[PDB]
Each structure stands twice: as structure tokens, then as C-alpha cells.
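Internal ticket - ligand job 1075, nicotinamide-adenine-dinucleotide:
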Amino acid sequence: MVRIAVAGAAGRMGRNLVKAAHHNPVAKVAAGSERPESSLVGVDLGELCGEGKFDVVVCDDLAKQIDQFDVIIDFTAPASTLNNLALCQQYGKSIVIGTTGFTEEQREQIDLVAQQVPVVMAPNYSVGVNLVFKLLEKAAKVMGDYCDIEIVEAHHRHKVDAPSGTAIGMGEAIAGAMGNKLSDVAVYAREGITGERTKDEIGFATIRAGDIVGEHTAMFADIGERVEITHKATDRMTFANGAVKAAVWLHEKPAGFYTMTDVLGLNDL
Amino acid sequence: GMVRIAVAGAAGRMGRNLVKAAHHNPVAKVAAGSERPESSLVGVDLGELCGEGKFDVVVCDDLAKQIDQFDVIIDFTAPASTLNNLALCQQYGKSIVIGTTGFTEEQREQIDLVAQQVPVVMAPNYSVGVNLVFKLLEKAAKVMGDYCDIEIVEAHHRHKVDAPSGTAIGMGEAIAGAMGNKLSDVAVYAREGITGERTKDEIGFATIRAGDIVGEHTAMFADIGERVEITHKATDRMTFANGAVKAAVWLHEKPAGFYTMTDVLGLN
Amino acid sequence: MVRIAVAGAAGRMGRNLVKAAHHNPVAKVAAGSERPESSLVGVDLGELCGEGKFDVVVCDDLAKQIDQFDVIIDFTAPASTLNNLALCQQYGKSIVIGTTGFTEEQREQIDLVAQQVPVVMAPNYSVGVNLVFKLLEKAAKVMGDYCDIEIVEAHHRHKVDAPSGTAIGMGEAIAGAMGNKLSDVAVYAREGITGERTKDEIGFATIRAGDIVGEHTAMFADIGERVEITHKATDRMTFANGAVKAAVWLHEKPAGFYTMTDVLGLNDL
Amino acid sequence: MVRIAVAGAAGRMGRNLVKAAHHNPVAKVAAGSERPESSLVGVDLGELCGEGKFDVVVCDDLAKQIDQFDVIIDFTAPASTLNNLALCQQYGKSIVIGTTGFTEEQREQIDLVAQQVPVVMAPNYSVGVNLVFKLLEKAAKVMGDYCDIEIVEAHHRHKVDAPSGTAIGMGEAIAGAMGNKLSDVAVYAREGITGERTKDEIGFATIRAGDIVGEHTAMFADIGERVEITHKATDRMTFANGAVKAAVWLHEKPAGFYTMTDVLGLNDL
Ligand SMILES: NC(=O)c1ccc[n+]([C@@H]2O[C@H](COP(=O)([O-])OP(=O)(O)OC[C@H]3O[C@@H](n4cnc5c(N)ncnc54)[C@H](O)[C@@H]3O)[C@@H](O)[C@H]2O)c1
Ligand SMILES: NC(=O)c1ccc[n+]([C@@H]2O[C@H](COP(=O)([O-])OP(=O)(O)OC[C@H]3O[C@@H](n4cnc5c(N)ncnc54)[C@H](O)[C@@H]3O)[C@@H](O)[C@H]2O)c1
Ligand SMILES: NC(=O)c1ccc[n+]([C@@H]2O[C@H](COP(=O)([O-])OP(=O)(O)OC[C@H]3O[C@@H](n4cnc5c(N)ncnc54)[C@H](O)[C@@H]3O)[C@@H](O)[C@H]2O)c1
Ligand SMILES: NC(=O)c1ccc[n+]([C@@H]2O[C@H](COP(=O)([O-])OP(=O)(O)OC[C@H]3O[C@@H](n4cnc5c(N)ncnc54)[C@H](O)[C@@H]3O)[C@@H](O)[C@H]2O)c1
Ligand SMILES: O=C(O)c1ccc(C(=O)O)o1
Ligand SMILES: O=C(O)c1ccc(C(=O)O)o1
Ligand SMILES: O=C(O)c1ccc(C(=O)O)o1
Ligand code: NA
Ligand code: NA
Ligand code: NA
Ligand code: NA
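stdout (C-alpha cells):
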């Protein structure tokens, strides 16, 4: 039975994760962390998510609680996540990564450690998004070669990274299905005189507003018609339940880099 | 090689685009066109109609008079007219691409029957995007359909006489079919007054009629916590027209049968 | 500081109102009521909305807590609301009425009491929706005569009525601004062969799905262009925030019958 | 009858303008221009827009055709438009400007010449958009102070400037109604780690794809709800008819800087 450590347990996602893990009857909330400076250190995890007392308190370092957990679920910040990844390599732990805003260099590192450590990494833990990735592949094979491809996303006012990890995942799925690398084609900004659109570019547009949990649209546009595939997230618990499910799934596995497509058995769709 | 095309209702919205599309397809010849006997456009050059010079082919009030001139009829008119053309095809060994929508169940049965003796393409939509969308709907329905609410919304221009659109119904059929169901067992086409709580299995249809909208379609798969929307937007009727001409070129070879755009595009 | 009494504090709206009043920094949650039968009598208001202990408990009669509050916010049932209105008259209090389903007789009584008591009454308390109604009037005056008008709405799977009361309110605002009665022009369903659209009809399309809190769009469509005005509700709290805003506004206002148009200053635009 | 000179008559807009001016019974198509390089110099204007033969040919300089026209309609490029504006000043002509992508310095210059030349300038010649500007003012007064404001637009693959002039016009209307300058608050791109959104920023997101004639959405987002005002253009003829109407209106007006709001009588909506 999976013992879970929630990194950054006081965060928007972290609180939902504690709750999701608590109510998943195949998982146990065994540990949680916060920034060393943070005041919420020493607080009961249950009191933090507003559901009684679990007898587990928030720590400033997961290395101190190594004997309590099997898997870390990490929706924090990239530097922090990399530390946890290092911790996993050293102590034989596993990790589910939700954090976004990694540089290309950092993702290379994650891939490397993933050869020794069991890792789930996805930019989105919802079923709908992972379905959408497969749908994008198919749309890209049929329409990609002669159509303009644009990705639009909206998120709440607190999101620190643009474009979102999910939007990038969408671009990668598309580019990958067309035998391309996203970074060869992506355009992340348009200001002033940009000239005519290039044929191959994948454009990204970003909206930051209110409490929007997450909207994503991929557009394939021809002269005379267009196809738009959209996902809208209503509740963070969707992501949280999905990540706890990935952790439960990951507990049974060897080293490797896994996606939610692997967890959900969506690879052949 | 060359397919000679007859465009039924050549002065119509679709008809004008079809003349143009057949002209531009290099494997096709615009050979004939028809209009209602009442119509003031009878005797007009087809080229003038779509604004592309003079073709030396004029609009007639009956395609039976031009039987020697064409191999395939492309028909986006009205159901009675289309049935008449279908009969013409049976009598004279011609082929037909049907775009017309708003057929009754009885009329669709007749079409299937004649399709046993005549080569027929019939599709709810002739665009590549829509046919792609149908395949995407199948996939979405297999993963999300059993647990999610399914709704179809469509918008069209103020002149459209049938609701919901043939395309929206085609989307419903693709979805229902992929889930091992019949669309008519689950479809709800109207909601007025107190309807009660939504049933789990129903597929809801909502219809918008406005302005000059060429065609928008959205299929929504909605769960508690998230939703997926797959949308198609048509900007130009040339999308439909090019696809139908492509179907006609394809159909010219062929023996008798009932064919879809899936058969034409090999998208199965 | 406006001291607020929330009638029917255990209700869907009531819980959100307690929370909204707590969060508004110009308002204090001072009292709350429930039906005398209710098992929630004597419960802390804060525990009720999961906001901690407020030191204020639910009572079965607001007359017992008269010294604690200035304004009542009432989203209950018509009989109960009329009782509170009477209470306001007797003890010199004010009221924000959210309750609907009054008979014409009852509305006449409300108007009578409103001569002596400060009263806000409206069919919708969301700032966005009230704003949208005003915008619809304007759009209808400029584009309504020659454009096709369509109203589209989406709601969750539990909504039993179609179209929604809000969608109808939108149709009424539009029709009213054009010197028409909605029921003369409205079309609520389209099935089979309907013929060409009429010039003056207002079409309604209704979507029922998932957990959608409420989306409304009004479209004005011409040949060559269209204008769409949309409201999206993300959380039912939005209505609660509007009513608390009305209560703050109503405080220290003299006797009168007021609407959300008065609260939002919507005539002075 | 107003004699119209169409600058850049072979362009997307230019061809529509020739056609629009031809069909407007109060206007006539008297002249048209193209780049001196252009192979369309010496071509009949009518043949260019596919409407028979007008007996008027495209020239490389409108100064040569001064005696043929009263008003120039200019949807070209900023340098070209400024040259035409200079021509108007010298020869006593009038101008309707559609061109977008002017710098703030260039707009100051336009304002200056507009003191002695009759000028209509707008980023959009459709009725719907000019309506939308007025609606945005109202929405900004009610929701702007406490909501996140985002503007999104889509256009076809050939558009060279981002964001669109219309999107900027929307931003200006909003900012202006709130007693702000757009350039103080506008954010035109978001890439990498941007941090949390500021309270006052107005975000712009830009989509370039296919044959999209023009879509614009302004969003006002709160916690719990959001309002979206959208305009969609279906045909360039909408813009073209509007500009020809402005030209007809402008003919015989005195010097001044005029908008479509003046032409349409929308100032006191
Ligand atoms: N993959 C997905 O499905 C998905 C879904 C939602 C959010 N996200 C991403 O997850 C991340 C979390 O977003 P959020 O809104 O929860 O952020 P947040 O700011 O609400 O929470 C992040 C938390 O991590 C904590 N933290 C930072 N550094 C730490 C360290 N060294 N040790 C322990 N704790 C630390 C912070 O104190 C904070 O409480 C973001 O990168 C976001 O983009 C991913
Ligand atoms: N399958 C698709 O992809 C698709 C796409 C567009 C339209 N449609 C359908 O195609 C049909 C045509 O639509 P439209 O918008 O072009 O309509 P329209 O009314 O503009 O044109 C139809 C034309 O058919 C002509 N017509 C009718 N009866 C006739 C007869 N007996 N002989 C000769 N001409 C006749 C009419 O006079 C008219 O000019 C509709 O049923 C519409 O729903 C289908
Ligand atoms: N104007 C608006 O924006 C708006 C929005 C939603 C609902 N409403 C209206 O508000 C009312 C309440 O809606 P709801 O969804 O909260 O209903 P609800 O049934 O969830 O809540 C009503 C509450 O009122 C309480 N109540 C009834 N009589 C009472 C009394 N005498 N004393 C104390 N409490 C009493 C009930 O116990 C219940 O808790 C309805 O009339 C509804 O039509 C208005
Ligand atoms: N205000 C509005 O309503 C509105 C609507 C549509 C487009 N626009 C704007 O109008 C402009 C035109 O866009 P378009 O899509 O028609 O572009 P386009 O490139 O298709 O057309 C521009 C034309 O102007 C010509 N031109 C350039 N310099 C010239 C010169 N010195 N003399 C003569 N001709 C010259 C070009 O050769 C070309 O034919 C853009 O700035 C666009 O943003 C404005
Ligand atoms: O895809 C993402 O990056 C993503 C999903 C959710 C969030 C967030 O809230 O920050 O970010
Ligand atoms: O799918 C359809 O029914 C459809 C597509 C387009 C039209 C139309 O113009 O009426 O109808
Ligand atoms: O607002 C604009 O800038 C605008 C309106 C139309 C176009 C275009 O076609 O490029 O650009
Ligand atoms: Na558990
Ligand atoms: Na041809
Ligand atoms: Na004219
Ligand atoms: Na200011």
C-alpha cells in the first residue's frame, strides 16, 4: 500500500493532493513539505487541508522523513522538484512530477535520472487532457502539413509561467506526430510588425485572468475551415486525483520515464 | 479520365460554389446545370453565375434534357428534387453525389434502395475537417462517452430550413455508433419548460440560426471537473464544394453502391 | 461597518452569503437564522461555511438578535421573507431580498413596506449579469432592428428548467429595449423542417452538461459580422458577493425600493 | 457624387473597396494606386475586383490623378498612408484611413495634419466593433477597477502587425474610460517566468491563422465570474462598405479628426 509524500503541501495543488491521497483508499498520506522559511512547518497535514488530524506534520525537508514514504508527489517549483528527484535517486524512492516551467536543460536532466528512478511526469493529470493529446496527434497527421497550427491557453492570475506546461505538451504532441521538434517551430510571442506568418510555425497565445483553473485550445486552420480541440478544467481535484492515481500506479514499477498516457493505458488510441 | 458534371440547383448557395469547384478541379468538366422551371436564371451561362467567364453551358430547367452531356450529378438542393434526380440516375445509368439534407426516414430508405442499383455518394458533410472530426469523436466517445454528458451544438445562417443540421446528426451517429448505440435511442432535440434532470445517456442537440454563418459544430464531452469540446468551423462553402467535386471524380469509376466521404477519403 | 444578518444561513445561498460577508472587509457577519425545526440551530455560523468559529450562532428567529445587525440578506422563501420584512418595519432595519416566486399581491405588500424601510430587491445579484443586461439594451438599440438575435446558455446536468431564468431575463431586456414583448418573438425549439428564420424571432438554444455553473451568450448577427456578449459564472459565490455589495450600499440609505441598477449606478453610465 | 481614390487597390482591402465604392450609389470609383514596382499598374480597376471594366486604371502615384478625386480611402501601410496624408494637405483633399500599425509618433503627426485636413481614422469600419467600443467603456466603469482585463484577437496568416489596431482600440477605450493611458498598463507578451499577474495590466494575446477575417474578445474577469464581449467579422465587405460610407460622410465636412463613432452618430450611446 502506497505511502505518499506531498511536496509543498500548503500550495493550491498541495492541499488538494493531501485531501485526494487521504480519500483514496489505496493511498496513505505519510509526509508533507514546505519551504524552510514557511510558517506552516510543524502544522498537522489534516488541519492544513481542513480534515481532522492525521498525526503527520509538515516538514521543511523530505530527507528527514525518508522512512515514512514510497512516492513523492511534487507540484512545487522547478529547483525544489530537482532536489526531490535527487533525493529519490539517492534513497530509492519514486516521484510523480506535476511542476511546470522547467527549462529544456532541466528536462534533459529529469530524463536522465528517470533512467534510474521511477518517474511519472506529465504537464496535466486529467483524463481529458491526455485524451486531447492523442486527438491532436491524429489531427496533426491529417491536417498539420497544410494548415496553420495555433495553441491558446488561459489560466488564473497566480500562474507564474507562460505558456503553460500543458500548452507545451500539446505543441510537442503535434510536432512529434509530424516528425518535428517543437522548439524548431514554436513562436511564443508576437509584438509590433511580425510579418506574414510562416507556414510551419506553431503560435502560442496566453491569457492570465481571474480564477480560471485552465483552458486550452489547439486550432488547425485551413483556407475555408478550421478545427478546434478544447479542454476546460473546472476543479483542481481533477488534477489531484489523477496524480494520486499515478502514484498508486507508479508504486508497482521499475525505473523509467512515464507519462499519464502510460498510467491511463492511452498509448494505442 | 474526364468526369462530366451536372450541377443541380446551380444558382443556389452551394450550387454556385460547385460550378466553380468543378471548373477548378482539373479532372472535372462542368457540363450541365439546373434550376427550378420558375427560375429567372434558366438560360444563363453557368460561368456568369459563379463569376468566371463564359463556359458555353447554360442552365436548364430539367436535367433529363442534358442526359448526354454528363456522367455525374452533384445535388445540393431540396429533398424532393434530389429524389427526382436519383430516379433520373437509375433510368439513364448515371451517378450521383448527394449533399442535400432534411430527408425523412422514409426517404432515406428509398435512397438506400436505389443505391443498390446506382453509384451514390451521400455524406452529411464534404469537408476534410468534418470527416476528421467524426473520427476524433469516435475516439473521444470510447474513452469518455460512458461516463460523460454528450451535447452537440450547431450554428447556421438564417436561410437553413432543417434543424438540427445533417452534420450534427452525423456527429451524433458517429458517437452513438462508437458506443454500440443507435442515435435515435438517446437523442434529445429540444428542451422547453420543465424537463427534469438530465438523463445519463441522452445526447442533447442545440440549434442556432443566425446571420450568414456558414456552419459551426461543437461536440462537448462533459464530466464533473472537466470538459472536452471538439469544434469545426466552416468559413467558405468552397470547402464543401471542393470535397463534393472530389467525391464525384472518385465516384465516376465505380459500381453501384452507397458510399460516404469516408470511402472517398479512405479515412476509415 | 455593516452588520449583516443572513436569513436561512444553512441554505445553498445562505452558506455562500456568510462566507461572502466575512470576506468583504466593509461587512461583519453578525447573525444568522434557520427554520425553528432545523437541527442547525445553535451551530456556529463559521463552522457552517467551514470558516472557523465566528462566535455567532444560528438562531430560529432574527427578532432575538435585533441588536446585533443593521441589514438582513434574505434568500429563503416568500412567506419567510415577508416575515423578515415585517421585522424590519417594526425594528428599523434594512433588507436585501433575493427570494423569488412572490405573487403580485405579495409584491404590492413589499412596495408598501418599502415606503418606510430601505429595501433592495432584484432577480439577480451578480454584478456581471446585471451589467450584461444593460449592455444588451444598448446593443439591441443599435443592432436589433436588422440583426438576428439568438440566446445560448449552458448549465449543469441537474438544472430542471429550460431555458434558464437568466436567459429569459436577457430576452426580456432585449425585447423591452426594442418596444416588444418577449413572448411575441421567442422561439424555444427547432426540430425538423422549420423553414427560413423569421426576421424578428429571438431564438433560444439550451445545453445541459456536467457541472457547468452557468454560461450565457447573446448573439446579434448581421450579414458580415456578429457581436456576442457572454457571462460565465464560475462559482455560485459570485451572486453572494453581489448581494453583500448591495447590503453595504444599502446601509445608512433612507427608505425606498431599490434595485441592483441603483446599487451599481447603472443609469449613470 | 463623391469621387473616390482607392490607395493600394490590388490589396485584400483595396479590391473590396473598389467593389464597395462601385456599388454605393452616392460614390464613384475615380482612381486607384499601387506600388510603383507592382505589375498591376495600368490594369483596369473593374477587372481587378472582378466587376467588368470601369475605364479607370491603376496608377503608381495618386498625385498624377489629383483632378479625378475628392477623397482617398487608404488601407495600405503606414509610410504610404502618411505620404497620402501629405498629398491631401497640399491639394485640398480628404482621407479615410484604415491602415494600422502606426507608432505613437506617427499618430501625433496624423492628429496635427487633421487640424487642417478632413480625416476619418479608425482601426475598424464595422458597426459592430464601434458599438463594442462603447460597450467596453461601460463594462470598464463597472468592472474595471477590480477585475482582470484581457484582450484576445485572431486574424489571418497574412496580417503583419500584432496586436491588431482594433485590439489596441479596445484597450484604449477601456483604459480611457478608467482615466488611464493604455501604454501604462498594456502587456503584449508573456514568455517564460512572468510572475503573478499585476492588478492593473491589460494583457493582449494574438492568434494568426488561416483566413480569419477578424475576431476580438475583451474579457473582464473576477473571482467567480467573467464577462466577455466578442466581435467576429465574416466578410471584408463589412469594413469596405463602412469605409465608403465614411468617405461619403466626410465629403464636404470641414477639417478635423473624425472617428467611425462620429460617422455613425454613436458618441452618446
Ligand atoms: N501537472 C498538472 O496537472 C498541474 C496542475 C496544476 C498545477 N500545476 C503546476 O504545479 C505547480 C504548483 O502550482 P500551484 O498553483 O499549486 O502553486 P502554489 O504557489 O499554490 O503552490 C506551490 C507550493 O510549493 C511550495 N514550495 C516551493 N518551493 C518549495 C520547496 N523547496 N520545498 C517545499 N515546498 C516548496 C510553495 O511554498 C507553495 O506552497 C505549478 O508549477 C503549476 O504550473 C500542474
Ligand atoms: N452535406 C453538406 O456538406 C452540405 C453543405 C451545405 C449545404 N447542404 C445542404 O444542401 C442543400 C442546399 O442548400 P443551399 O444553402 O445551397 O440552398 P439554396 O436554397 O441556396 O440552393 C438550393 C438550390 O436548389 C434549387 N432547386 C430546388 N429544387 C430544384 C429543382 N427541382 N430543380 C433545380 N433546382 C432546384 C433552388 O432553386 C436553389 O437555387 C440544403 O439541403 C443544405 O442543408 C449540405
Ligand atoms: N435573485 C437571485 O440572484 C437568486 C439566486 C438563487 C436563488 N434565489 C432565490 O433565493 C431563494 C433561496 O434559494 P436557495 O437555493 O438558497 O434555496 P435553499 O432551499 O437552498 O435555501 C433556503 C433556505 O431558507 C431557509 N428558510 C426557509 N424558511 C425560513 C425561515 N422562516 N427562517 C429561516 N430560514 C428559512 C431554509 O431552511 C433553507 O436553508 C429562492 O427563493 C430562490 O428562488 C435567488
Ligand atoms: N480599419 C479597418 O477596418 C481595417 C480592416 C482591414 C484591414 N485593415 C488594415 O488595412 C491595411 C491593409 O491590409 P490588407 O490586408 O488589405 O493588406 P494587403 O497587403 O493585402 O494590401 C495592401 C496593399 O497596399 C499596397 N501598397 C503598399 N504600399 C503602397 C503604396 N505606397 N502605394 C500604393 N499601394 C501600396 C500593397 O501593394 C497592397 O496591394 C492593414 O494595415 C490592415 O491592418 C484595416
Ligand atoms: O499546464 C500547466 O502548466 C498548468 C496546469 C495548471 C496550472 C496552474 O494552475 O498553474 O498550470
Ligand atoms: O450539415 C448540414 O445540414 C449543412 C451544412 C451546411 C448546411 C447548410 O448550408 O444548410 O447544412
Ligand atoms: O484591426 C485591425 O488591425 C485589423 C482589422 C483587419 C485587419 C486585417 O485584415 O489585417 O486588421
Ligand atoms: Na487514503
Ligand atoms: Na475542371
Ligand atoms: Na457607385
Ligand atoms: Na490613472
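Auto-summary: The radius of gyration of chain D is 19 Å. Chain D has nine helices and 14 strands.
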